[PDB]
C-alpha cells in the first residue's frame, strides 16, 4: 500500500491496525517496507484490486 | 413504513473513482466485489472437484468408448471438430463426384 | 498395418517414448539422427544399446525416440533406456524369444538400469 | 471461463474427460469448396438472424421478469403462511386449554 | 411532514373512475369479454389458436 | 459359439404385462371463469332467486320455527323458488321415522324439486357440483363443511338459519 | 419431404418466432414445433370486395419472408432492436476489458 | 389369464397364477435381476447364512452378559463379518438383524464390486468379462461370479496382463508400455 | 389478401388451422372454386401433376359451431365420416362447413322450415352432394321420418323456446345410442325474463330429463354475448 503514510516511523506507529478497502474487504497492516518510505505490506480477506482505496478509520 | 418519514428513507448516492486515480477505471464497491468473489469461489469449487476426481481415477477403468475415442501426444483428449455423424476423410469416388 | 512397438525410458523428470518398427535401419532421436544427441560426451551412453549387441540387430528395424522433460544427462539416460527396452520388446513380439532373452541377458549383464529404472525414493531412516 | 489445468485434465477419469476441440489452421477442401449464396440470400440470412435474436432476447427478458415477480410473491406468500401457522398453533392451544 | 400523495386521491370520483378502468382491463384477462362483435373484415384471430387447450366447463 | 452370461429366463414383475400390476401400459382443460361474474360479484343473478336446500337447513328451520318460503322471502325481500334435490330428499328419507315432520314439510308443493342424475345420495357433492357448474343458485345450508366449500367457490350466495330467521351472506344486494 | 422442408424452412421459423416480429402484436404463449404434416397455401381474396384486404398483383410475393423483408417499418424496427441488443450483449466483455487495460497502460 | 368379468372378479378373487403367497413378493427373483446372479439357489444359500447368523446372534443374546465365551464369540463374529466386508463398520449387534441382508452379501460379490469401483460399467458386462477370463484377485484368475471377496481384496481386483481390454485402455490413454508385454 | 399461410391439422379431425401472423380456423372445400357466403379461401397445391385443392375460412362471428371450436370444446362429434342432423339450417352458412368437415363419405341432413333459405339450401346442396336438404318443421320429426335414418350427431341451431323438446324428438327418432348432441342455446331467444345462467341450467336439466347426458358446456363469449354450446351424448340407458 502506497501513500497514507510519509515514513516507516509512521507505519511503525500504526502497525497492526485494521484497514479496509472501499469494497469492504477487511484487512490489517503488517509491516513497513524498507526502501519506499510510507509504503507497507497489508494482508486482506482476499485479493484486492488495483482500482481500490484502503481506509484507516481514525478519530 | 409504519413510523418512518420519507425524508428519512432518502437515497444516499454513491461515490466515483478519484480523478487522480482514474486510469484504473471504476472504483468498485461491495456489489461489484461480491460479483467478483462468488464467481471466483464457484470456479475454485469446480476445480477442486475435478482435482479430487483426478486423485480418484482408478486406472483399471475400461469403457467401450475408449476404442473410438483417442488421445493426442500431450495426453489430453482429441475431440474431432467435424461431425461424429460424418467422416473427416472422404473416399476417392466421393472426391471424384464433388470435384 | 506395420509391426510396431512402443516403450518408455525414464530418469528424474525426462521421459522418452521409443517407437520401434520394421524398416531399413534408421535411429532418430527427436527427428534428428542419433549421432547428434548432445552433450556429445554422453553420446556413447546413448550408443551402448547399439554397441552392446551389434548393429546387425538394428539393420532391419527403425527406431524413433521423442524425449521431453529433464536435463541433459537425464535425457540421455531416458534415451538409452527407451532404446534398450524397445529393442527387447521388438525381438520379443516379432523375432524369436531366444534373441529376446539373449538381449535381456546382454543388457542386464552390462547394467539392468538400461531396462529397469531406480524409481521411488528416499529411505526414512 | 473456467480454465482447468492440463496436468489435472490429462489425469481425469474417462467420464470426466473434457472435450476441448482445437481450432483449425488448415484451409480444408470442404470449407474452400462449399458455396454461399449472395444478395437476396445473404439479406435473408441477415433477416432471419435478426428475427431469431430478437425472439431469444425477448424470451430472456420475459423469463427474468417472471423470476423477479415470483421471488417477491414467494416472500409475501411465506409471510402469509407464517402468520397463518402462528394463528393455528395458538388456536390449537386454546382448544386444548378449554378441553 | 406528509408523504407524497396522489392527484387521483385528491378527487373521490376520479379515483373510482380510474380503478374501474383498471378493473375492466383486468376483466379481459380472466374471462373473455364480448367486445361488440366483428368490427370490419374478419382478419383472423390476431393472437393465436391453441389446439390443445379446451376452456370449457365439464359436468360433474 | 454359445453366448456369455447365460441366465435362466424367469418372469419380470417389472415388465411382464401378463400379471396384474403391469396392466398400466395431451389436451388440457382450464375452465373459464363465468361470464356471470365480475371479480367476485356475480352480476347476473336477479330475483326471482332459486335456492338449493339441504337437510340440516330444513332441520334447523323446523327447530327454529321458520317457514321455508316465507323465511326466504323475508330474508331476501324477493320472490324465492326453493329446490330440493333428489339426493337431499333421499337423505331426509334415510334419516328415519324420527324425521317424519321434516320429510313431510319438505313435501310441499311450494317447494319445487330438481332431478339429480348420479349414483349415491351425497347431497354435499351434488350441491357443490351443480352450483359450481352454473352460478345461478343460492345455497341454503348449515353444514360447516358445506358452508366452507360454498363460501370458497366465488359468486355463490349462502343462506343459513341463524337466530330466529334466515341470514344471507354472499349476496351483495340485500337492502 | 426434406427437399420441401428445405424450401419452407425459413417461414416456419417466422411462424415459430411470430412473437417478436411486430412490437405491438403479443400472441398467446404456445410453443409450436413444426408439425409433421402441413401444407403451404396462398389466400384467395375473391373478386367480390376490393381495396380493403387486396394485396395487388405488383406486391404479391412467394414467401412470408419476402413480405417481411419488403416491409420497411419492420426493417427499421429490426435493425434498431438488433443494434440495441448487440450493444447490450457486448457491454463489458472483451473490447471493454482490453480498452481498460490500455487505459492502464497509456500513462 | 383372461382379465375376468365383474361377476368373475367377485366369484373368485384369490386366484392369481402369477404371484402366490409363498413367493414373498418374488424378492429372490428381484434381487437376482438386480445383482445378476447366474444360476438359481444362490439366493437361498445366502439366506441360510443370514438365518444362521441371526440364530446364533440370538443365542449369543441369550447367554448372560458376563461370560468371556459369549463376549469373545460375539466380537469374533462381528470382526469376521467386518473382515469379509458384509458390514461397513463394527457397530451394534442390533445391526446383526437390521443390517445383514442377502442384498449386502450379494454386494460383496465380484461383479458388483467391479461395477462399484468402475472397472466395468454395468454388472452384466462385468459377468461378461469374468466369464471371458480377464480379471484376478492377487495372482489367481477368477472364472466364476460366485467368488465374493473379503475386505482386504478390494484393492487387488485388477485384470490379468495380456488382457486386451486393458491394452485398449492403455492405448486409449497412450501410456501403452509393451516391455511389460501388455 | 394474397399472403401465404401454413395449413396444419387441428386436434379435431377434419378441421385445420392456417397459421400466418393471424391464424384462421379452416376447413377443406368440398366444392372447390367458389365461396358460399363470401368467406376467404386458401388454395394449396398438393402433390400426374399436383392438384390445386382449397380451403375455406370458418368465421366465428358467423358460426356458433366455429365459435365453439375456437373457444375450445373437448369433443365435437362432427367427424370426418359421420352423419349429422343439422336442425335450423338457417342458410348454408354453417351447414357448408359442417358438410365439408364431415366429408364426402358422410352425410349432413340440413333441416330448415322457411322456404327462401330452403331454395338457397338446395342450390348449395347441388355443389355439395353430401347435403340432404329437408324443408320441414323440426317440431314434427314424423313428417320427414322417411327421408333420414340413424344419424350419429345432432346439431341444433334452432332459436325457439321449445328447443329441448325439438332436440329430444329428433334424437329419439334418428340419433343412435351414445351419439352426439351439440346444442347452441341462445338465452335471449329462449326467454329474457331470467338471466343466462338460469336458462342454461334449465336447458341442461331438460336435456338430462330427456336422457341426454351433458358432457361439457362453453359460453363462447368473445363472439356472442349470452350464448352457449352444450355438448352431450345420447345415453339412452343410465345417465348414472
Ligand atoms: Zn343429487
Short mmCIF file of C-alpha atoms in Angstrom, two decimals, chain C residues 6-8 85 89 92-93, chain H residues 174-179 181:
data_model
loop_
_atom_site.label_atom_id
_atom_site.label_comp_id
_atom_site.label_asym_id
_atom_site.label_seq_id
_atom_site.Cartn_x
_atom_site.Cartn_y
_atom_site.Cartn_z
CA UNK C 6 6.26 -48.60 -28.09
CA UNK C 7 8.38 -48.35 -24.94
CA UNK C 8 9.28 -45.75 -22.34
CA UNK C 85 13.84 -51.99 -23.77
CA UNK C 89 10.24 -55.77 -26.77
CA UNK C 92 10.05 -60.48 -28.07
CA UNK C 93 6.99 -59.76 -30.15
CA UNK H 174 -1.45 -43.75 -24.77
CA UNK H 175 0.54 -44.87 -21.75
CA UNK H 176 0.82 -48.22 -23.51
CA UNK H 177 4.06 -49.80 -22.45
CA UNK H 178 4.88 -53.02 -24.23
CA UNK H 179 8.07 -54.05 -22.45
CA UNK H 181 4.04 -57.33 -22.53
#
